[PDB]
Curated annotation (Swiss-Prot), chain A:
Residues 1-12 are annotated as: Mediates interaction with KIDINS220. N- and O-glycosylated. It comes from Homo sapiens (Human). Residues 15-92 form the Death domain. The death domain mediates interaction with RANBP9. It also mediates interaction with ARHGDIA and RIPK2. Homodimer; disulfide-linked. Heterodimer with SORCS2. The extracellular domains of the heterodimer bind NGF. The cytoplasmic region of the heterodimer binds TRIO. NGF binding mediates dissociation of TRIO from the receptor complex. Interacts with RTN4R. Interacts with TRAF2, TRAF4, TRAF6, PTPN13 and RANBP9. Interacts through TRAF6 with SQSTM1 which bridges NGFR to NTRK1. Interacts with BEX1. Interacts with BEX3. Interacts with KIDINS220 and NTRK1. Can form a ternary complex with NTRK1 and KIDINS220 and this complex is affected by the expression levels of KIDINS220. Low affinity receptor which can bind to NGF, BDNF, NTF3, and NTF4. Forms a heterodimeric receptor with SORCS2 that binds the precursor forms of NGF, BDNF and NTF3 with high affinity, and has much lower affinity for mature NGF and BDNF. Plays an important role in differentiation and survival of specific neuronal populations during development. Can mediate cell survival as well as cell death of neural cells. Plays a role in the inactivation of RHOA. It is found in: Cell membrane; Cytoplasm; Perikaryon; Cell projection, Growth cone. It comes from the Eukaryota. The lineage of its organism: Eukaryota, Metazoa, Chordata, Craniata, Vertebrata. Residues 1-98 are cytoplasmic. This is Tumor necrosis factor receptor superfamily member 16.
Swiss-Prot record, chain B:
The chain holds residues 199 to 312 of 312 of the full protein. Adapter molecule for TNFRSF1A/TNFR1 that specifically associates with the cytoplasmic domain of activated TNFRSF1A/TNFR1 mediating its interaction with FADD. Overexpression of TRADD leads to two major TNF-induced responses, apoptosis and activation of NF-kappa-B. The nuclear form acts as a tumor suppressor by preventing ubiquitination and degradation of isoform p19ARF/ARF of CDKN2A by TRIP12: acts by interacting with TRIP12, leading to disrupt interaction between TRIP12 and isoform p19ARF/ARF of CDKN2A. Found in all examined tissues. It comes from the Eukaryota. Glycans are attached at R37, R47. Residues 24-91 are annotated as: Interaction with KRT14 and KRT18. It is found in: Nucleus; Cytoplasm; Cytoplasm, Cytoskeleton. It comes from Homo sapiens. The gene is TRADD. This is Tumor necrosis factor receptor type 1-associated DEATH domain protein.
Amino acid sequence: KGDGGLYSSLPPAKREEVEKLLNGSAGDTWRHLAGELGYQPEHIDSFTHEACPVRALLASWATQDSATLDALLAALRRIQRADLVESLCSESTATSPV
Amino acid sequence: AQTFLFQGQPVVNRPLSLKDQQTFARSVGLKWRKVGRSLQRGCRALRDPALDSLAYEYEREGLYEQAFQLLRRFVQAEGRRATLQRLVEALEENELTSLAEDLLGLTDPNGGLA
């Protein structure tokens, strides 16, 4: 590793933000991420039990300490999906509207 | 407010309610067919000939009931995790950029006596 941040440590509402942001985009990033993470083909096919199969990958990856932002970013970079990295970094920030 | 960037415009990122089902059918009018067909490409759960039966099953009330329950057809697939994000890809195919924000009620002055 070379940074600090567990994706599993984020609140349920922030995981929903990822699970929604890719939902109205090109063919869900879970397919490209599963291949890079070394996820078995039968596990990918078991996660299609729900109409949002991306949520099933993100949730079942979050069950283990391998769910670091540092490992997630490395995999997104290998599949040329830095577009999603920027969109998430623009939500993982502070605000003061009131 | 949880919101995403789409076409350079902010839009609230949540499941569509009964308000959205009614405002949709009332605001698309003729575009009800087009959004339905565009949502087939964006959401494979709706790519079946649903529109063909929906048009006939809801022909009794017209464009209103036709489009009112078309919006429920997406919420039926998940509704907890389904959000306007998938619906906006259908409006993006028909350049309905202003409609995608008007749908959630963003037509208002966000607190400006109306």
